[PDB]
Design an enzyme around this catalytic site. Structure first.
Site, short mmCIF file in Angstrom:
data_model
loop_
_atom_site.label_atom_id
_atom_site.label_comp_id
_atom_site.label_asym_id
_atom_site.label_seq_id
_atom_site.Cartn_x
_atom_site.Cartn_y
_atom_site.Cartn_z
N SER A 64 0.74 -1.23 0.00
CA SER A 64 0.00 0.00 0.00
C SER A 64 0.77 1.27 0.00
O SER A 64 0.14 2.34 -0.24
CB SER A 64 -1.03 0.05 1.16
OG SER A 64 -2.21 -0.55 0.65
N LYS A 67 0.46 3.59 -2.82
CA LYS A 67 -0.63 4.58 -2.92
C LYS A 67 -0.05 6.00 -2.93
O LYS A 67 -0.75 6.88 -3.36
CB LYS A 67 -1.76 4.46 -1.93
CG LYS A 67 -2.51 3.08 -1.96
CD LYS A 67 -3.61 3.04 -0.94
CE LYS A 67 -4.50 1.82 -0.95
NZ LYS A 67 -3.70 0.59 -1.09
N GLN A 120 -11.07 -4.52 -1.22
CA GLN A 120 -10.45 -5.27 -2.31
C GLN A 120 -11.48 -5.49 -3.39
O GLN A 120 -12.66 -5.60 -3.05
CB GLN A 120 -10.05 -6.67 -1.85
CG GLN A 120 -8.96 -6.76 -0.79
CD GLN A 120 -7.72 -6.04 -1.29
OE1 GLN A 120 -7.55 -5.99 -2.60
NE2 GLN A 120 -6.99 -5.46 -0.50
N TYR A 150 -11.38 2.92 3.87
CA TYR A 150 -10.11 2.59 3.19
C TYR A 150 -10.30 1.47 2.16
O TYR A 150 -10.56 0.35 2.63
CB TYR A 150 -9.09 2.07 4.22
CG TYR A 150 -7.71 1.89 3.69
CD1 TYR A 150 -7.12 0.65 3.67
CD2 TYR A 150 -6.95 2.98 3.25
CE1 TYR A 150 -5.82 0.44 3.21
CE2 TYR A 150 -5.64 2.82 2.78
CZ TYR A 150 -5.09 1.57 2.76
OH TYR A 150 -3.80 1.39 2.32
N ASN A 152 -8.82 -0.33 -1.77
CA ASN A 152 -8.02 -0.46 -2.96
C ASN A 152 -8.86 -0.11 -4.19
O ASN A 152 -8.32 0.49 -5.13
CB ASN A 152 -7.42 -1.86 -3.12
CG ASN A 152 -6.39 -2.14 -2.06
OD1 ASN A 152 -5.72 -1.21 -1.62
ND2 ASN A 152 -6.27 -3.42 -1.69
N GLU A 272 -1.11 10.20 4.42
CA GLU A 272 -2.03 10.51 5.56
C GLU A 272 -1.23 11.41 6.49
O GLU A 272 -0.03 11.05 6.64
CB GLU A 272 -2.43 9.23 6.29
CG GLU A 272 -3.66 8.55 5.61
CD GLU A 272 -3.82 7.08 5.87
OE1 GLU A 272 -4.19 6.30 4.98
OE2 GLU A 272 -3.48 6.78 7.06
N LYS A 315 2.71 6.41 5.68
CA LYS A 315 1.85 5.42 5.06
C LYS A 315 2.37 4.03 5.43
O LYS A 315 3.59 3.83 5.43
CB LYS A 315 1.81 5.51 3.54
CG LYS A 315 0.80 4.40 2.97
CD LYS A 315 -0.51 5.13 2.74
CE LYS A 315 -1.68 4.22 2.56
NZ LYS A 315 -1.59 3.03 3.46
N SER A 318 1.38 -3.34 3.09
CA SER A 318 1.73 -4.77 3.24
C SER A 318 1.26 -5.51 1.98
O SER A 318 0.43 -5.05 1.19
CB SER A 318 0.97 -5.38 4.42
OG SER A 318 1.14 -4.73 5.65
#
Length: 361
Positions: A64, A67, A120, A150, A152, A272, A315, A318
């Protein structure tokens, strides 16, 4: 008294050594940015089987953290005048009908407030036709901007739509517009055959694993990078002024603006942020899956608030086999990159980072 490399070495070593042990991480790579100067450290092995140690050149899956690359590429596009955050999704994917999409903008996808896109993309959605179908049938939980979930499937979609105007692929756009300019030559979406010798194996229940293909993989979680590249990436974001390409410098800045307030945490584009100084507990406990994956009310910051130096930017990311963490405080010109070839609890990552950095402030 500016700490010396060896003092920085003892703090780092003292923290990580124990960590690696309790969490049973095969190999690690950490970079400390202390008064703008990088210090690298490597421990363990990249391939237990083939007995290859972690190096400054070892490629890790960022999950992630990818991102952050998305957010910046989106930023650059904005800066170029190619896209507008306020533009409707529909503008970019006209094949995408369904009135549930009428009031959703780029912003909402980028910032996970479209109304509940799932974490997901579903397991039975593995090709682009299925993807359209998925979104076409999608049923919002809340009104746009109501809450942050949150996902994807949200930021992932933002990435894909954002490169559209340019007529480039995401992979092409990313390489051309961000990696090349910042000289991230050891940062990949697709790792060449030629670089496989530097690609670490991720470990899951003692078994070697690599991230698998997926819809919107590049956009949400498929970047691979080394300790050195993550470090240049942190420096560039820490201070955009050093960046020569005006649009990229601007995109970095936009990616760190504040769009939503979600109780003491602010949402940028991938990054963030929290005001500095911050309370350790806030960041640690806000990193727990119990908080980080929940649907929370979101108060809009419109017009967005600008990037401030007095911030804690970070951020977590994983993959099945890897755990990454990156944080920086622009004002103190300090940061850390933590790359592991085993996914371990978020709060342990955040907590170890804080320990190290508290000692350097």
């Amino acid at each position: 008294a500016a700490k010396t490399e060896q003092q920085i070495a003892d703090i780092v070593n003292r923290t990580i050594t124990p960590l690696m042990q309790e969490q049973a991480i095969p190999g690690m790579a950490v970079a400390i940015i202390y008064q703008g100067k990088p210090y690298y450290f490597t421990w363990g092995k990249a391939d237990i089987a083939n007995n290859r140690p972690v190096t400054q050149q070892t490629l890790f899956e960022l999950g992630s953290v990818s991102k952050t690359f998305n957010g910046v590429l989106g930023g650059d596009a904005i800066a170029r005048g190619e896209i507008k955050l306020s533009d409707p999704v529909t503008q970019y994917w006209p094949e995408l009908t369904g009135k549930q999409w009428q009031g959703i903008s780029l912003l909402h996808l980028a910032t996970y407030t479209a109304g509940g896109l799932p974490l997901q993309v579903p397991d039975d959605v593995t090709d682009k036709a299925a993807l359209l179908r998925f979104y076409q049938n999608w049923q919002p939980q809340w009104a746009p901007g109501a809450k942050r979930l949150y996902a994807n499937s949200s930021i992932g979609l933002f990435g894909a739509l954002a490169v559209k105007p340019s007529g480039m692929s995401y992979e092409e756009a990313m390489s051309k517009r961000v990696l090349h300019p910042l000289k991230l030559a050891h940062t990949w979406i697709t790792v060449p055959q030629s670089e496989q010798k530097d690609y670490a194996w991720g470990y899951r229940e003692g078994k070697p694993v690599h991230v698998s293909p997926g819809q919107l993989d590049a956009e949400a979680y498929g970047v691979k990078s080394s300790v050195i590249d993550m470090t240049r990436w942190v420096q560039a974001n820490m201070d955009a002024s050093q960046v020569q390409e005006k649009t990229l410098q601007q995109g970095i800045e936009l990616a760190q603006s504040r769009y939503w307030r979600i109780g003491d945490m602010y949402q940028g584009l991938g990054w963030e942020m929290l005001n500095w100084p911050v309370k350790a507990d806030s960041i640690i406990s806000g990193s727990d899956s119990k908080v980080a994956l929940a649907a929370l009310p979101a108060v809009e910051v419109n017009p967005p608030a600008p990037a401030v130096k007095a911030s804690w930017v970070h951020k977590t990311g994983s993959t099945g086999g890897f755990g990454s963490y990156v944080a920086f405080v622009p004002e103190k010109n300090l940061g850390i990159v933590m790359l592991a070839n085993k996914s371990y609890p978020n709060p342990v990552r955040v907590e170890a980072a804080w320990r190290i950095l508290e000692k350097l402030q």
